Structure formats: C-alpha cells, structure tokens
C-alpha cells in the first residue's frame with residue numbers, strides 16, 4: 326500500500342510537540358546548564374540553536390515530507406551512498422530508548438513514594454538517612470559533610486548509590502518493577518492505539534505546561550531566587566574556553582530537538598506534500614527552546630533558595646549530573662501548601678512529558694525498522710511479536726542501569742550513547758550530504774514547491790557552513806583538550822568504562838563508513854563510476870498522487 330497521512334494538520338503538531346518537548350527540556354537542560362557553570366552554557370546553547378537546531382530539525386521534517394519515507398529509506402531515496410545515516414540514527418534512537426525510560430522509572434518511583442501523609446524526602450529521620458543528614462532550615466542554625474535530606478533520598482534509597490561502576494551491587498527490584506511498569510505502558514500504547522490520545526489532547530498537552538507555570542511562580546517568589554537567576558543568566562567568559570560546554574550545549578540542542586534519530590523524519594513523512602511545515606516547525610521550535618529557557622528560571626530559582634538556606638555555593642548545593650531535577654523540584658513541592666498533592670501532580674506531569682516522547686521515539690524506530698522488511702513485518706501477528714521483542718530486549722539492557730551501580734552506567738549512556746560526538750557525527754553528515762552532495766539550492770526547489778514559497782537563505786548557509794563548522798570544530802576541539810567523563814565532579818571513570826562508553830558512540834558512528842563499504846562492494850564497475858552512481862538520488866519525490874515537480 327502507501328504510507329498513511331495525518332488525519333489533520335493539528336494531529337501533526339501535537340504528535341511532534343509531544344515528541345520533542347519532555348525530559349530533554351525539564352530534566353537534561355537544567356543539569357547540563359548547572360554542570361557547565363551557570364550562564365556560560367547559554368551562549369553555546371543559543372548559538373547552536375539558531376545555527377543548527379532549527380535548521381537541522383526543519384531539514385529532517387522536510388526530508389520526511391519530500392520522500393514520504395521513514396528514518397532509513399528517506400536517505401536511500403535522497404542518496405544511495407551515505408545511507409548509513411539512517412542506520413546510525415536507528416542505533417542512536419535504540420540506545421536512547423534504552424536509557425531514557427530509566428528517567429520515567431525514577432519518576433514513577435517518586436510518584437509511588439508520594440502517596441503518603443508526609444513526603445519521604447521532607448525530613449531525614451528514616452532508615453536510609455545517614456547520621457550526617459540534617460534539615461535545610463536548621464542548617465544555618467547549626468565542615469562540608471552535612472548532606473540534606475533531599476540528596477540522601479535520591480542517592481541513599483532511590484538509587485542506593487554504589488561506590489563505583491565496577492561495583493554494580495544488587496539489582497533494585499523496586500526500580501525494576503517501576504521500569505517494567507512504564508515499559509508495559511509504552512508497549513500497550515504502541516501496539517494498540519498508536520495515536521490514541523486524541524480524546525484528551527486538551528489535558529495531556531496543556532497540563533504539563535500548566536504545572537510548569539505553577540513551579541515557576543513558586544520558584545521566583547522564593548527568597549533566594551535572586552542569586553539563582555544571576556547564576557543562571559550572567560555568563561562566565563573563562564568557561565567558554567573549555568570545549569566541554571560547547572559539546573554539552575551543542576548536543577543538548579540536538580538531544581532536545583530529537584534530530585539525528587529518524588523520529589522527526591518519520592513524523593515529517595506522515596503529513597501532506599502540500600502542507601506548509603516551515604512555519605509550524607518555527608512555532609514548534611519556539612515552544613521547545615522557550616520551555617527549556619523558561620523552566621530553567623524555575624529550577625535555578627530553587628537552587629538559589631537552597632543555597633541561601635544552606636549557606637553554601639549555588640554550584641555546590643545539588644548534584645552536578647542527572648538527578649538535579651529530582652533534587653530541586655521535589656524540594657520545591659515541599660514549600661508548597663499541600664506538598665503531597667502537588668508532588669503527585671509534578672511527577673504525573675513529569676511522566677506525561679516523557680511518556681509522550683517515548684511513544685514517538687519507540688514508534689520512530691519501529692516504523693523505521695519495519696520499512697526494511699515491509700512484508701515480513703507490518704502484517705498480522707508478526708508486528709505483535711517484533712514490537713515486544715524490541716521492548717523486552719531494550720528493557721533487559723535497562724536493568725543494568727537499575728542496580729546499585731546503575732547510575733554510573735546511566736551517565737555513560739547519557740554522555741555517549743545518544744549525545745555528544747555521536748550526534749555531532751550524524752548531524753554533520755546530514756547537512757553535508759544535503760548541502761554539498763544533494764545541493765542546498767537543489768532542495769529549495771522541492772521546498773518551494775512544497776510549502777508554496779522559497780524561504781530565506783538562513784537554512785541554506787546553516788546546512789552548508791554553520792552546522793559543519795560547529796560540528797567539526799567542536800568534534801576536533803573536544804579531542805584536543807580531552808577531559809574524561811566524571812560523575813558529580815568527583816567520581817573518575819575507569820579506563821574500560823570510558824572504552825565501553827566510546828563503544829556506544831562508535832556503535833552508531835561507524836554505521837556511516839560501513840554502509841559506504843557495503844554499498845561500494847555491492848555496486849559493480851570501476852570505482853569512480855561506482856561512486857557516481859551511488860550519489861544520484863533515486864527520485865525522492867516519487868508521489869504523483871500529490872501534485873509535484875521533477876526532483877532535478
């Protein structure tokens with residue numbers, strides 16, 4: 326048959342809006358900004374945003390709309406060579422689906438722990454609390470070994486933090502069941518009712534932002550909000566010399582915008598050919614970076630309040646890693662009237678933000694993979710088995726991040742698997758093929774015939790120069806001034822862990838050069854003609870059903 330289109334223009338936006346607005350906004354951005362000093366994170370953040378994040382995102386959407394194909398076959402239509410971008414995106418999204426559901430596992434654990442008379446992380450008098458812990462209020466009344474009850478609950482119970490990655494400890498069975506419960510939710514929403522949230526689009530979309538306004542209002546009114554915003558906004562120039570801030574902020578754009586995954590291309594392939602997706606992406610792009618920036622005020626206002634209460638530096642008040650959103654926001658809900666009621670709403674909001682995203686990415690790779698075998702899959706019970714196998718295998722690998730030493734594996738996956746040099750590798754090759762091989766001006770003829778008008782030269786230069794320079798320059802300068810990954814600024818990773826971590830990056834990076842080798846080997850003839858035949862697009866806009874022109 327043919328790839329079914331969206332039922333309406335509104336269906337495309339809500340699916341895309343919930344597909345890349347989520348834990349990448351309210352969870353990953355706050356601690357990446359917190360890790361890389363304060364406001365020095367924002368200059369690379371906005372530079373990468375307006376240089377490549379919007380351009381590459383629109384490029385993927387427009388490629389999907391042009392080819393009417395998924396993550397992988399879109400590149401096959403665009404360019405038979407460099408078709409390994411699809412497989413690299415599939416590997417990246419596979420690892421992302423492996424490690425991104427652990428955040429929802431932790432969120433479910435907090436949601437379950439929240440159904441009590443008193444929130445467990447308000448006061449530290451429980452079994453897991455070390456004798457060093459004491460309350461934030463009486464911290465000033467009472468060196469540098471006095472931990473707060475909030476960090477204790479996250480480390481010494483929820484995580485049961487192990488001394489290192491090479492001490493995995495014992496699997497946390499409570500978190501494994503929470504990990505299975507969210508995976509069962511995704512499976513039961515992917516197999517039946519691929520897009521079944523249409524009845525409650527009003528609540529399932531507006532509430533996550535409605536809660537974000539509530540947290541923002543509470544955060545700004547706190548006594549210590551002044552120092553937090555100055556920490557969040559005012560940049561430190563000396564930190565711009567470290568290449569890590571450019572890598573972190575550079576790939577936080579690519580992470581938050583879900584590009585180089587094949588989900589955007591799949592989402593962009595489900596809309597009409599004669600649909601103006603240029604304007605909607607910019608409005609959708611504004612919603613993402615607006616959410617990350619505005620919610621950044623909320624969490625960083627809490628950090629200033631926490632630092633003021635404890636009388637410690639803002640940079641030393643919480644965890645410089647994943648779990649800042651789990652240390653700041655659960656502290657914010659404590660100061661609210663009826664703390665239990667709001668804490669339930671926050672972690673329900675946190676769940677709805679990521680569940681909608683996980684639905685898109687999991688379906689993105691499933692749709693991308695079934696394109697490889699349209700006959701073997703997408704027919705009867707063979708999709709039932711295949712989707713479960715993807716979810717079951719990806720769940721078992723997620724168990725390694727649930728054990729007591731599971732946090733350290735989480736930082737490895739977070740830094741390497743679906744972020745960092747792997748994203749800079751695919752994003753560079755996405756733009757390099759389009760701008761220099763396919764032709765930036767050559768694609769504009771398709772886009773102008775598609776949205777009805779020719780957009781400005783912003784996209785042309787971003788793919789041609791800005792994105793390759795930003796990707797290549799940051800890739801080179803990261804290795805030149807190499808710094809090993811660390812967890813919470815203290816833990817130094819063992820050599821094999823970094824070697825394992827680089828395998829996660831190289832597992833998808835090596836897809837691009839490999840597929841070139843197979844493509845060259847399969848093609849018969851002289852080497853130059855072999856290459857020349859493999860760069861000719863195979864009629865990407867082969868859809869006479871919708872009015873169109875010739876691709877060349």
Ligand SMILES: CCCCCCCCCCCC
Nearest residue numbers: 412416832836839840843844
């Ligand atoms: C060209 C068709 C087959 C492509 C397979 C490439 C290998 C992908 C997986 C790499 C190691 C996980």
Ligand SMILES: CCCCCCCCCC
Nearest residue numbers: 419420423694715718719
């Ligand atoms: C990490 C989970 C890996 C799942 C990928 C399944 C690929 C099946 C090829 C048809």
Ligand SMILES: CCCCCCCC
Nearest residue numbers: 412415416419420832
């Ligand atoms: C981590 C492995 C990803 C699976 C990709 C398979 C593509 C055929």
Ligand SMILES: CCCCCCCC
Nearest residue numbers: 534537612615616619
């Ligand atoms: C907290 C939600 C903010 C959304 C802003 C969108 C326009 C900048």
Ligand SMILES: [Cl-]
Nearest residue numbers: 354581614617
């Ligand atoms: Cl962002």
Ligand code: NA
Nearest residue numbers: 343346347678
């Ligand atoms: Na979402």
Ligand code: NA
Nearest residue numbers: 345349350581
């Ligand atoms: Na995002």
